[model samples]
Target: AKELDATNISIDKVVGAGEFGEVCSGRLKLPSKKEISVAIKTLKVGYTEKQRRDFLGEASIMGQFDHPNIIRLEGVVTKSKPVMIVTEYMENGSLDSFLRKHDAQFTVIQLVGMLRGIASGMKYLSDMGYVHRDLAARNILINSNLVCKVSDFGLSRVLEDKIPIRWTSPEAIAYRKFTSASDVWSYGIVLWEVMSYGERPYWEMSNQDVIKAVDEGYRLPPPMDCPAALYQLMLDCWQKDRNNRPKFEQIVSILDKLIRNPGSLKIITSAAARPSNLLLDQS
Candidate 1:
């Protein structure tokens, strides 16, 4: 990982906050005399060694990842007090907030395109044998062009020693067993969030209730105006048996097909309204 000179980076304003410190918009001056806008994540003062490791872990992981759909890590500041992580700034911010702000404006194809980008990023990570452990709309960043890129790699698996309940898979929740399959399950919930224009999954339901519901074979109902085929895909990703779930590559293929032939998603049926019958005759 390239070590950035903290002096060369100027923090403009606070954009958001993270568990360790503030996320700020900034400008970085390169040795070539070029300047670029970036997002800076700071490591709060008095952080423990473990916290320092976890915070810097994001930079390390991001440094190794080179994908168009994955967030880009510019460099990091470790030798300085209040360590910082510099990354390409995403103007549209988180995908969740972006979708919520312009809900109903995006076409199904556009939304599917966003999902495809995320899946492609995940496919890259999966091919590299990297299990994200956490995948959700909130972790996705949207650019000014409305392109979504997977972000928040360093915060995966644990947050303050607590697991994220809503998007986590049953296996992971039960035994702390995380794998690409569990990420696929989380992607299913993310698909739900996207289709529902960023609505919270299992709204108003307690974490225990969500667990009980899924354990009892319950799945989310189709979002308003959600195509039957798309919802079917979501159901496929959420199969109780991880082996039964489609891989990220499969998800990308199906979405690519939908994007190429949007009409295919219109091949609807009342049977798809039932979770058990989602895949019947649809594939």
Candidate 2:
């Protein structure tokens, strides 16, 4: 009967699930009969104290961040078991889903907007000294408005709290710790993912395999409709060596020029041989 009378708090539907947790669409009915939408990320019950603390930390971090390109924390459900991290719902879902289902195509202008959104988010986090280790399309949540925001800072490492690991490459024998530079590397991948339009990362190969291929100089092909300058920018960002990667500021400048005058981007020649579906593939 309690289940039938459970009207105070109503759990909507499961939006998405991951290996460690699930995100559900939910709503809380107030005494005044108002319903507010919320995204609930719940870890399994019986989690250890450490696990619980981490979940709380993740929620706290999301709450602290207030950027247009980042998800907002609406509230949290920590008074009971199976704690939940409540956040603003992204109706459009992840970038991958948005591109795949909507048949979304990007012009040079749209691509510039995406790049700006990501870079601004990254800079905001960097200013706060938090390095988001997992910056990819999967983590970038999109709202119904088609705006991309950097989300899911579960793997983030604090620059002020601990020492940063110097990773030679994402595929190297020794896994490097998280840092701003690594975040740049991730931004590159995210750009590639966006350009490819939900294409599988590493082309279905394991991370280690991708690292090896990357070390050997296996670059992705340009999309049929992408501008030459944008492709070059992606390549510069994806260079194997972290130090060799372009800074986000430079990325902003490159994108800024393209945004102000897209024709300038045409100077970049399309590689004689490029993939027709590169944009979708990267996404």
Candidate 3:
């Protein structure tokens, strides 16, 4: 609900691109006269009047959400020439690329811990009747402590918003029906990505080829070191019948038990000092 002054933001460096245009990290001067690092999402120039409003659509979406597992939106700068969406800067960056740097370096429990946070976030979103439309590992941001939060609300945009074919469910792909269930379908792929340490889903199989295979009931195989129960959870998420898909609330509790139960993840404590902040949401 904040309309930050354009003069208060200083773009330091270009980081990546959001759906609208290039994203940058910069210093945001708070009213207290304190400067903090923040990520800025800019609406590229030359956009139509409607397109500018469409860009603010995401800001309004983020404004309604206030959860630890959901990315925090600082505010938006609409009065400014180049309108921007500002959020807290995540030190570790997006989950997909972050995981890629650490190929299988983390244990199953650690990955499950991350997924639990993601599911909890999604549960909050679906509970609020907001379908993210796109839910992928690429859209999850991580902090220095490995706390992952969902990011980039597409705001249920237009035909130009191309859904990720691999992450999307059959109904979303075929009938253009994007529901919380479709998001569950996308979450399964993100689960695979986390377990596989950023392995590409469905491989390089042609998009149409992957679509046909999925339509015919083909699901991705378990990643290396994947536990059977975890694979079963993935299967539960990918059910072609959207109603059959487990709800995010169920998924959050499932991951909680999966993380707490020692028999599932086994030992390999690895280190003593590294345990405290590894996982949370114990309750």
Per-candidate TM equals 0.90, 0.79, 0.86
Candidate 2: RMSD over Cα atoms? 6.0
Candidate 3's C-alpha runs over 4 A off are 32-35, 155-161, 267-283
Best by TM-score: 1
Please give, for residues 34-143, the per-residue lDDT of candidate 1 as tens digits. 99999999999999999999989877887878999999988998887889889999998998988898889988888998999999999988887777876989999988
User: Which candidate number has the best lDDT?
Assistant: 1
lDDT of 2 by residue, 172-279 (tens): 224655567778877777776777677755666565555555566666666546677877777777666668777777776777878888787666445565543222
lDDT of 2: 0.68
How much is the lDDT of residue 84 in candidate 1?
A: 88
> In model 2, how large is the Cα lDDT of residue 79?
63
For model 3, what is the C-alpha lDDT against the true structure?
Answer: 0.84
Go through the candidates in order and give the clash count of each.
Answer: 0, 15, 0
Poorest 10 consecutive residues of model 2 by lDDT? 162-171
C-alpha lDDT of residue 78 in model 3: 81
Off by over 4 Å in 2: 1-10, 28-36, 160-177, 206-208, 265-269, 272-283
Ten-residue region with minimum lDDT total, candidate 1: 274-283
